[PDB]
Amino acid sequence: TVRAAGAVLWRDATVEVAVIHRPRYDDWSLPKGKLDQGETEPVAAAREIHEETGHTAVLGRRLGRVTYPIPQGTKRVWYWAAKSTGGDFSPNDEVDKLVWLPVDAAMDQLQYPDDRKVLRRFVKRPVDTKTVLVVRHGTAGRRSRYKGDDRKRPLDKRGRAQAEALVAQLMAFGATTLYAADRVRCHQTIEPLAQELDQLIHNEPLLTEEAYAADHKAARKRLLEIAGRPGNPVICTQGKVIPGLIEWWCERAKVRPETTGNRKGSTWVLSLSDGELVGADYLSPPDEK
Template sequence: MSVTENQPVPGGIDDEPPAPVRAAGAVLWRAGAGGVEVALVHRPRYDDWSLPKGKLDPGELPAHAAVREVAEETGFSCVLSRFLTRVNYSVPAAGGGRAPKVVDYFTARAGNGSFAPNDEVDELRWLRTDQARELLSYPHDVGVLDAFEKSPAESATVLLVRHAKAGKRSEWAGDDNLRPLTEAGRQQRDALHSLLPLFGPSRIYSAPRLRCEQTVAPIAAELGIGIATEPLFSEEGYLGDPDAAADVLRRVAGGHGTAVVCSQGGVIPDLVARLAHSADLPLGEVVSRKGSVWTLTFALDRPSGNGSGPALRLAAADYLADPLA
């Protein structure tokens, strides 16, 4: 097999280092007869087996590129569940030398579709992870598969969103609960409207703030569902009983399908840190800029014998920056 993706090539050195090549992909999975199966694609140009991935189009976010590349290379639609890992390596640069390549990978559950050979991919195989590990051509893809296998087999996703920009509180003369999004905030809202549906949300919750509700209103309208307000996701409600707020978020996670929760800057960092601490999940600094999203993955532990239902613990927390940043 001739594999060229990671082989050095001759060439000169430019005065300026080449810009990183940005790409995104996914571990596309489905439930097979023998358990979880993942999709590998064969690229005749390189004669290699890899995970579906490709370069970002201008102005495209990694999540958008991952979903698009999955569809283009495999023929399947998909729903993202979480950011998985980032891989760095080098590739041949235009004009010679090497350029850094940065690939963001997501976990994606396969939807409808069927494979047909195309210009980039001539074969697709659905394999158990142990079989896929043996077939993959590159060590960095094996590392991505390792990260996928460490994810909980049964999980639930909550997209914890900080509301978009609404101007300064000191410059708003009315009831602060009714402070609306600014023009910059509406642009962030629209960017979130293009991002969050990639994760397949089916339920939406919000702090009782106009700016929070406005941030997620377009998604609710598109889904044809209402926005459930939760006072414990507001700053004063959270500060009054943070443990109760964390319990409510766990109950939200335990509902059917992915949930979107829109809250405030005085809530999100402490809430995520609290959930992580209770699950012994090490996290660094928990930031939360306006228009950003924490993708929270909860493990669904088996129900206890007392009929109380499954216990939920935070298994992963991944930060997606403001889409317009």
């Protein structure tokens, strides 16, 4: 019942991680806290890291889910690896001490078994990763009811709201460059993000459902091309293209999706290290759980 998110916030020492002390429970733990209304887990994680540690951070690989019982029902915390991009700590509302420890010492500092389990996930794969964000376009009504060229079918009111809600989510992962398939609804999905970054959306005719249907290899090739460029790209496409591209890349690399889906407005976070896939994390559409 109670949804939360947090992080292993790290910095280059080789790495040190942040362990926080809170007076209420006199505990040592990883920074995390509750989703506010309208936030998704990554949005909440980045926010809570800032509030509890004073550091700005960019989320990378997901580090699984923790659940435990509380007074208000059940607590569920999703965790991310999060690289500090700077900031400074000062005792605040929730937290009065913060220590940066190398992993072995941090393991001994962390008193909850689940936090230790999260830290063990953290060290099991590279954490200095780049991120490709594959997004299914937002809701766009029904083909049946669109009088016009279906390629031009726009987002509906709900999908416009999904597009706005996606900016904070995608920014949590340090999105830098934007790409969309050659359909109105894919471009509109990331046009709020484009404004926020003052970036142009590159058009990708090779990544439409039609194009992929006739040459899937050209599309795979384009994806790796895009992935190879500097930065963390966002690629917004249609439903029939995503599953094929995600399964292809996952089995290549023996990466397993803990969660999975393909809903309108959903995001796959693909984490790469030295060009090799090290995570594939499926995020629900920003207005579903």
